[PDB]
Amino acid sequence: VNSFSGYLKLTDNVYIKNADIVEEAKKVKPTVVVNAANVYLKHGGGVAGALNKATNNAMQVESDDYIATNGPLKVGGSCVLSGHNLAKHCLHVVGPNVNKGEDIQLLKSAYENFNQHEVLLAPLLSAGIFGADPIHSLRVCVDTVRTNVYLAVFDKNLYDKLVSSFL
Ligand SMILES: C[C@H](Cc1ccco1)C(=O)N[C@H](CC(=O)O)c1ccc2c(c1)OCO2
């Protein structure tokens, strides 16, 4: 038993809700919140900008030190950093950004990072400003992630669509 509420169950291990991931995180304090990161950990907009703003820019400060020490992430890769006031940990995961021409097949590799964590609150990778089809992203999520994932979808309209078209 865990503290997530109001989720619709899609599969044995995948759950979905129309919610703002920022407010969802401040209420659950999940062990892991996933950020829709880029390779530079520049949290300017989308989910990343919203999460970072909710940390009063502490996420960005920590991220800049990480990059200065380690260099950029790989597309499809991830790193674990602090969750600040939102979660114990933040798993920064880089899905491919279609608006940069990145290979969509890397979306499966990106979701594989979720399997290193027993339970996660997460957005749909490569959705939103990353330009992928959220329905394809949901399919890859369901077919790749084996751990327990709670997907927060900000847009109510999108959410209804994802549910109604789910196979
Ligand atoms: C089709 C809709 C358009 C839309 C955007 C906002 C409302 O509708 C869409 O791309 N949605 C994705 C996925 C989602 O809805 O979780 C998304 C991603 C990041 C976000 C985000 C929304 O909003 C805040 O950061």
UniProtKB/Swiss-Prot annotation:
Regulation: Inhibited in vitro by GRL-0617.
Subcellular location, record wording: Host endoplasmic reticulum membrane
Domain Macro: 1-167
Membrane topology: Multi-pass membrane protein
Catalytic activities: Thiol-dependent hydrolysis of ester, thioester, amide, peptide and isopeptide bonds formed by the C-terminal Gly of ubiquitin (a 76-residue protein attached to proteins as an intracellular targeting signal)
Subunit comment: May form homohexamers. Interacts with N protein.
Function: Responsible for the cleavages located at the N-terminus of the replicase polyprotein. Participates together with nsp4 in the assembly of virally-induced cytoplasmic double-membrane vesicles necessary for viral replication. Antagonizes innate immune induction of type I interferon by blocking the phosphorylation, dimerization and subsequent nuclear translocation of host IRF3. Also prevents host NF-kappa-B signaling. In addition, PL-PRO possesses a deubiquitinating/deISGylating activity and processes both 'Lys-48'- and 'Lys-63'-linked polyubiquitin chains from cellular substrates.
UniProt-recorded name of the protein: Papain-like protease nsp3
Native organism: Severe acute respiratory syndrome coronavirus 2
Upper lineage: Viruses, Riboviria, Orthornavirae, Pisuviricota, Pisoniviricetes
Gene name of this polypeptide: rep
